[PDB]
Design a protein around this ligand. Structure first.
Ligand SMILES: CCCCCCCCCCCCCCCCC[C@@H](O)O[C@H](CO[C@H](O)CCCCCCCCCCCCCCC)COP(=O)(O)OCC[N+](C)(C)C
Ligand SMILES: CCCCCCCCCCCCCCCCC[C@@H](O)O[C@H](CO[C@H](O)CCCCCCCCCCCCCCC)COP(=O)(O)OCC[N+](C)(C)C
Ligand SMILES: CCCCCCCCCCCCCCCCC[C@@H](O)O[C@H](CO[C@H](O)CCCCCCCCCCCCCCC)COP(=O)(O)OCC[N+](C)(C)C
Ligand SMILES: CCCCCCCCCCCCCCCCC[C@@H](O)O[C@H](CO[C@H](O)CCCCCCCCCCCCCCC)COP(=O)(O)OCC[N+](C)(C)C
Ligand SMILES: CCCCCCCCCCCCCCCCC[C@@H](O)O[C@H](CO[C@H](O)CCCCCCCCCCCCCCC)COP(=O)(O)OCC[N+](C)(C)C
Ligand SMILES: CCCCCCCCCCCCCCCCC[C@@H](O)O[C@H](CO[C@H](O)CCCCCCCCCCCCCCC)COP(=O)(O)OCC[N+](C)(C)C
Ligand SMILES: CCCCCCCCCCCCCCCCC[C@@H](O)O[C@H](CO[C@H](O)CCCCCCCCCCCCCCC)COP(=O)(O)OCC[N+](C)(C)C
Ligand SMILES: CCCCCCCCCCCCCCCCC[C@@H](O)O[C@H](CO[C@H](O)CCCCCCCCCCCCCCC)COP(=O)(O)OCC[N+](C)(C)C
Ligand SMILES: CCCCCCCCCCCCCCCCC[C@@H](O)O[C@H](CO[C@H](O)CCCCCCCCCCCCCCC)COP(=O)(O)OCC[N+](C)(C)C
Ligand SMILES: CCCCCCCCCCCCCCCCC[C@@H](O)O[C@H](CO[C@H](O)CCCCCCCCCCCCCCC)COP(=O)(O)OCC[N+](C)(C)C
Ligand SMILES: CCCCCCCCCCCCCCCCC[C@@H](O)O[C@H](CO[C@H](O)CCCCCCCCCCCCCCC)COP(=O)(O)OCC[N+](C)(C)C
Ligand SMILES: CCCCCCCCCCCCCCCCC[C@@H](O)O[C@H](CO[C@H](O)CCCCCCCCCCCCCCC)COP(=O)(O)OCC[N+](C)(C)C
Ligand SMILES: [Zn+2]
Ligand SMILES: [Zn+2]
Lengths: 197, 147, 274, 49
C-alpha cells in the first residue's frame, strides 16, 4: 500500500516494484524460487570460493603479467587505452573479465610467440578458464539442479504418503484389501479427522 | 551475448565518478539475470526429464512385475504348481474378459447360464464388483485343517 | 463374496480384432485411484466392441479393406517423398531455369554417379532393406532427363495423390465414418491430416515453400522426439512464469539504467546509404 | 584411550583451560585472517598510502 501510494505521489515508477512483489507470490514461481533459495548457504559459500579464487589469480597477474592489463576504452569529450596498477583496479578488471567467454583471454595483450613469457601466459589463461569458468560455475549450477531434485523428491514422498496411507489411523492401505471394510470408507466414516475436531 | 549489459555500453574506465556504480550494475545484472534465471529455466527442464523418466520406469515395472485384473505382485506365485507365467495366460487373461463382455452383449438376453445373468445384472445397472480384486483361487490351500 | 470359475465359447465376432489396438489397450490403460485398472478398461471395452462391429462390417469391402490394410506403407511413402522433395527445394531455389550447367551439373553428375554406386552397394549387401532407394535413384535420374520444375510438379502431384488415398485409408480404418460428419470434424488427428493436405495442396499451388511446414508437422510425430518435446512442454507453466520473472527483472534493470546511466547507452551501427 | 588421556589431563587445569576454548581460537584466527586479507587487498600500492 505504501509503494502504491508513493507511486501515485512521487515520480511514479514504483509499479515495477509492486509488480515484482505481487507476481513473485504465485505457487509454481515461488516453488522454483524456493529451489534456488532453500540451499542458499552452499551457493553463497561457493560464490565466496569464486571470489577468493579470482583474488588469487589477480595476485598472480599483478605479480608477473603486470603490463599486459591494458584495456580498450572510448572517452567522452568535455589514445583509447589505459593501464592500471592498484590491485583493486586489477581485481575489478578481473571481475569484469570473469564473464565473457574465455575469461582472462580476449582482454589482455595476446603476446603471440615472440616474448619469452608466452608459455606462462598460455598456461595462465587456460588454467584460469578451466578451474574458474568451468568448475566453479558448473558447481553453482549443479547445486541448483540438485536442489530441484531434492525438492521434487520431498514433494513426491509427501504426496504418496498423503494418498496411500491413512491419516490418524496410520495404516498403509494394503491391510484394507478385503473383509468388508475398505479404505475409502475407513477414511470417511471411521477415522475422519473432522469428527476428531 | 555473454556478459549482458557489459560489452555494449560505454566502458567508463576509472575516470568518471560513476565507475564503481557502473561496475556494480554490470556484475549484479550478470549474476542475477544471466546466471540464476537461465539456470532456473534449464533446471526446470532437466527436472521434467527426471520426473518423466521416473513415471515411465514406475509404469513399466508395475506393468511387468504385477498381474493385470488380478492385482497380485508376482512373489505370491513362487511355488505350488501355479506360476505367474501361466496365471497371466490361462487364469486372468483380460482377452477372455473381453470375450465375456462381448458374449454378454451379443447374446439374446435369455437362455444363458447362471453366472452370465449375474454378470449382466452387474453390467447393465451398477458397479463392477464382480472382478477378482485381489484373489485368485490358486494361493488358497485346502480346508482340511479346520475341518 | 465367493469366487467361481466359468468356461464359455468365445464369440465369433471377437476374431475381427487387430493387433495394433490390442497392444494399444494393453499399454495405454492406467490405474485410476485405488491401484486398479478396471474402470478405464470397461470404457475402452465398450469402445473395442464398437470397433469390432465396424471391422466386421468393413470386412465385406475388400478393395477398401485392401486400401485400409497398408496405411503404414502410405505414411512411409508420404514421409520419404516429403523429405526428398524438401531436400530438392532447399538446395535449388534461385530457380529461374537452374538447368544451365555452369559447373554445377558436372559436380552434380559426379554426385549422382557416387549415389548410384552407393545405392548399388546397398542393394547388393542389404537386399531386403532399401526399397525406397531405387525410387530415389529413379527420381534423381528423372532430374537429368527433364527440368527441375516439371520434376517438382510431378513429385507434388504424387504427394497429393498419396495423401488423398491415405485419407480414405484412415477414414476406413476408424469407426467415425458412420457416426456422422461433426464427429470426425471434432476429431483432432483428422483435423491435423486435413491441415497437412491443405498445406501440401497450397505448396503445389502458391509460391511453393510450404514443405518445410509439412516436414515440421510430420517429423514432430515420432515417439522419442515427441517424448523430449513432452519433457519441455509438460511443465510449461513454470517455464512461462519464470520467463515473465525474467521480463520483469530486466524491466527493473532498464528502469535503473534509464534513471542513472542514461548517456552510456550508445550502440555501434552501420547505416545503409540511400 | 582418549578417556584415559582426558583423565590424565584433567589435573593440568591451565592447559585444560587453554584446550577447552579452542573453537574460540579458531574463530578469532579466521576472522582476523579475513579482515587482514581485506586490508591487504584494498591497499597495496603502499609506498606510504
Ligand atoms: C536504486 C534506488 C533508486 C534511488 C532513488 C532516487 C530517486 C530519484 O531518482 O528521483 C527521481 C524519481 O525517480 C524515482 O523515484 C525512482 C524510484 C523507483 C525506481 C526503483 C526501481 C528499482 C531500483 C531498486 C526524480 O528525479 P529525476 O527523474 O532523476 O529528474 C530528472 C529530470 N527528468 C525527469 C526530466 C528526466
Ligand atoms: C530479498 C529479501 C527482502 C524482502 C523485501 C520485502 C519483502 C516483504 C516481507 C514479507 C514477505 C512475505 O510476504 O512472505 C511471504 C513470501 O512471499 C514473498 O516473499 C513476497 C515478497 C516479495 C519479495 C520481495 C523481494 C525484493 C527484492 C510468505 O508467504 P506464505 O508464508 O507462504 O503465506 C502466504 C499465502 N500463500 C501460501 C498463498 C503464499
Ligand atoms: C534472484 C532471486 C533469489 C532471491 C529470492 C529471495 C528469497 O527467496 O527469500 C529468501 C530469504 O533469503 C533472502 O533474503 C535472499 C536475498 C538475497 C538477495 C540476492 C542477491 C544476489 C546477488 C527465503 O526466505 P522466505 O521464503 O521469506 O522464508 C522461508 C523460511 N523457511 C526457510 C523456514 C522456509
Ligand atoms: C545468489 C545467491 C542466492 C541467495 C540465497 C539466499 C540465502 O542466502 O538464504 C540463506 C539465508 O542465510 C544466509 O546464509 C545469509 C545470507 C543472507 C543474504 C546474503 C546474500 C548475499 C548475495 C549473494 C552472494 C539460507 O539460510 P541458511 O543459512 O542456509 O539457514 C537456513 C536453515 N536451514 C539450514 C536449517 C535450512
Ligand atoms: C603445465 C606446466 C608444464 C609447462 C609446459 C610448457 C613447456 C615449456 C617449454 C617451452 C615452451 C615452447 O616450446 O614454446 C613453444 C610453444 O609454446 C608452448 O609450448 C606453450 C605450452 C602450452 C602447452 C600445454 C598444454 C596443456 C597444458 C594444460 C594446463 C593445465 C590445465 C613456442 O614455439 P616457437 O617460439 O614458435 O619456436 C621455438 C621452439 N623451437 C626452438 C623448438 C623451435
Ligand atoms: C604450473 C605453472 C608454472 C609455470 C609453467 C610454465 C613453464 C614454462 C617455463 C617458462 C615460463 C616463465 O618464463 O616463467 C616466468 C613467469 O613467471 C610467472 O609468474 C609464472 C606465471 C604463472 C603460472 C600460471 C598460474 C598458476 C597459478 C594460478 C592461480 C592458482 C592459485 C592456486 C594457489 C595454490 C618467470 O620468469 P621471470 O622470473 O620473470 O624471469 C625471466 C625468465 N628469464 C630469466 C629466462 C628471462
Ligand atoms: C556492493 C555494494 C558495496 C560497494 C563497494 C564499492 C566501494 C566504493 C568506494 C569507492 C570505490 C573505489 O575505490 O574506486 C576504485 C575501484 O573501484 C571499485 O572499487 C569498484 C567496486 C567493485 C568491487 C565490488 C566487488 C564485489 C561486488 C559484488 C556485487 C554483487 C553481485 C578506483 O580506484 P582509482 O580511481 O584508480 O584510484 C582512487 C582510489 N585511491 C584514492 C584510494 C587511490
Ligand atoms: C511468416 C508468415 C509468412 C508471410 C506470408 C507472405 C507470403 C509471401 O511472402 O508471398 C511469397 C510466397 O512466399 C510464401 O508464401 C511463404 C509462406 C510459407 C513459408 C513459411 C515458413 C514458416 C513461417 C511461419 C511470394 O512473394 P515474394 O516471394 O516475396 O516475391 C518476390 C519476388 N521473387 C520471388 C523474385 C523473389
Ligand atoms: C504450437 C501449437 C499449435 C499447433 C499448430 C497445428 C497443430 C495441429 C493440431 C493437431 C495436433 C495433433 O496432431 O495432435 C497429436 C500431437 O502431435 C502433434 O502435435 C503434431 C502437430 C505438429 C505440431 C505443430 C507445431 C506448429 C508450430 C496427438 O497425437 P496422439 O494423441 O498421441 O495420437 C496420435 C498417434 N500416435 C500415438 C502415433 C502419436
Ligand atoms: C519449442 C518447442 C516447444 C513447443 C511444442 C508445442 C507442444 O508441445 O504442444 C503443447 C501445447 O502447448 C502449446 O501450444 C505451446 C505453443 C507455444 C509456442 C512456443 C513459443 C516459444 C517462444 C502440448 O499440447 P498437446 O501435446 O497437443 O496435448 C497434450 C494434452 N495433455 C496435456 C492432456 C497431455
Ligand atoms: C518457451 C515456453 C515453452 C512453451 C510451454 C507450453 C505451454 O505453455 O503449455 C502450457 C499451456 O497452458 C498455458 O500455460 C498457457 C500458455 C499457452 C501458450 C503461451 C506461450 C507463450 C510463449 C512463451 C512465453 C501447459 O498447460 P498448463 O497451464 O500447465 O495446465 C496443464 C494442466 N496440468 C497442470 C494439470 C498439467
Ligand atoms: C548496492 C548498489 C548501491 C550503490 C553501490 C555503489 C557504492 C559506491 C558509492 C558511489 C556510487 C554513485 O556514485 O552512485 C550515483 C549513481 O546514481 C544512480 O542512479 C545509482 C547507481 C545504481 C547502483 C546499481 C543498482 C542496483 C540495482 C539493480 C536492479 C535491482 C532490482 C531489484 C529491485 C529490488 C549516485 O550519485 P548521483 O546522485 O548521480 O550524484 C553524483 C555524486 N556526487 C554528488 C558525489 C558527484
Ligand atoms: Zn484410519
Ligand atoms: Zn491375476
Amino acid at each position: 500500500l505504501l509503494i502504491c501510494a508513493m507511486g501515485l505521489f512521487v515520480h511514479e515508477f514504483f509499479y515495477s516494484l509492486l509488480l515484482f512483489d505481487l507476481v513473485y507470490r504465485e505457487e509454481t514461481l515461488l516453488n522454483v524460487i524456493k529451489s534456488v533459495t532453500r540451499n542458499g548457504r552452499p551457493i553463497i559459500l561457493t560464490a565466496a570460493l569464486a571470489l577468493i579464487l579470482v583474488y588469487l589469480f589477480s595476485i598472480v597477474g599483478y605479480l608477473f603479467f603486470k603490463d599486459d592489463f591494458i584495456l580498450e576504452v572510448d572517452r567522452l569529450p568535455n589514445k583509447e587505452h589505459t593501464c592500471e596498477t592498484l590491485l583493486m583496479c586489477i581485481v575489478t578488471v578481473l571481475s569484469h573479465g570473469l564473464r565473457s567467454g574465455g575469461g582472462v583471454g580476449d582482454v589482455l595483450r595476446k603476446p603471440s610467440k615472440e616474448e619469452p613469457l608466452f608459455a606462462a601466459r598460455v598456461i595462465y589463461d587456460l588454467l584460469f578458464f578451466f578451474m574458474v569458468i568451468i568448475i566453479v560455475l558448473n558447481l553453482i549450477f549443479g547445486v541448483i539442479i540438485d536442489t530441484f531434485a531434492d525438492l521434487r523428491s520431498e514433494k513426491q514422498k509427501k504426496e504418496e504418503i498423503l494418498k496411500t496411507t491413512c491419516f490418524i489411523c496410520g495404516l498403509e492401505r494394503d491391510k484394507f484389501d478385503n473383509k468388508t471394510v475398505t479404505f475409502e470408507e475407513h477414511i470417511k466414516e471411521e477415522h475422519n479427522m473432522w469428527h476428531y475436531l | 551475448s555473454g556478459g549482458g549489459v557489459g560489452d555494449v555500453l560505454r566502458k567508463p574506465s576509472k575516470e568518471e565518478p560513476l565507475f564503481a556504480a557502473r561496475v556494480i550494475y554490470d556484475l549484479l545484472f550478470f549474476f542475477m539475470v544471466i546466471i540464476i534465471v537461465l539456470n532456473l529455466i534449464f533446471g526446470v527442464i532437466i527436472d521434467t526429464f527426471a520426473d518423466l523418466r521416473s513415471e515411465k520406469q514406475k509404469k513399466e515395472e508395475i506393468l511387468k512385475t504385477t498381474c493385470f485384473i488380478c492385482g497380485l505382485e508376482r512373489d505370491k506365485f513362487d511355488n505350488k504348481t501355479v506360476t505367474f507365467e501361466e496365471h497371466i495366460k490361462e487364469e486372468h487373461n483380460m482377452w477372455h474378459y473381453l470375450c465375456f463382455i462381448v458374449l454378454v452383449k451379443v447374446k439374446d438376453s435369455t437362455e444363458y447360464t447362471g453366472p452370465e445373468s449375474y454378470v449382466a445384472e452387474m453390467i447393465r445397472e451398477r458397479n463392477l464388483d464382480w472382478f477378482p480384486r485381489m484373489r485368485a483361487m490358486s494361493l488358497v490351500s485346502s480346508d482340511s485343517e479346520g475341518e | 463374496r465367493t469366487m467361481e470359475q466359468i468356461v464359455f465359447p468365445v464369440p465369433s465376432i471377437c476374431e475381427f480384432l487387430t493387433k495394433e489396438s490390442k497392444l494399444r489397450i494393453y499399454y495405454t490403460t492406467e490405474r485410476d485411484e485405488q491401484g486398479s485398472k478396471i474402470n478405464d478398461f470397461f470404457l475402452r471395452s465398450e469402445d473395442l466392441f464398437n470397433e469390432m462391429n465396424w471391422q466386421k462390417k468393413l470386412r465385406a469391402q475388400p478393395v477398401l479393406y485392401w486400401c485400409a490394410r497398408n496405411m503404414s506403407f502410405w505414411s512411409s511413402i508420404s514421409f520419404n517423398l516429403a523429405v526428398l522433395m524438401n531436400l530438392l527445394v532447399a538446395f535449388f531455389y534461385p530457380f529461374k531455369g537452374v538447368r544451365g550447367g555452369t559447373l554445377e551439373p558436372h559436380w552434380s553428375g559426379l554426385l549422382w554417379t557416387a549415389m548410384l554406386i552407393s545405392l548399388a552397394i546397398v542393394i547388393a549387401l542389404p537386399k531386403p532393406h532399401g526399397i525406397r532407394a531405387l525410387i530415389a535413384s529413379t527420381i534423381l535420374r528423372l532430374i537429368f532427363s527433364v527440368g527441375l520444375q516439371p520434376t517438382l510438379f510431378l513429385l507434388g502431384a504424387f504427394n497429393v495423390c498419396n495423401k488423398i488415398i491415405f485419407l480414405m485409408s484412415f477414414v476406413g480404418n476408424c469407426g467415425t465414418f458412420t457416426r456422422g460428419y461433426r464427429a470426425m470434424v471434432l476429431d483432432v488427428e483428422f483435423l491435423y491430416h486435413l491441415l497437412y493436405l491443405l498445406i501440401c495442396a497450397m505448396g503445389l499451388f502458391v509460391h511453393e515453400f510450404f514443405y518445410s511446414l509439412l516436414l515440421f508437422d510430420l517429423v514432430y510425430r515420432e515417439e522419442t522426439l515427441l517424448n523430449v518435446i513432452k519433457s519441455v512442454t509438460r511443465n510449461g507453466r513454470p517455464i512461462i512464469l519464470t520467463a515473465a520473472l525474467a521480463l520483469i527483472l530486466v524491466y527493473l534493470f532498464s528502469i535503473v539504467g534509464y534513471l542513472f546511466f542514461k548517456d552510456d547507452f550508445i550502440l555501434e551501427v552501420d547505416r545503409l546509404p540511400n
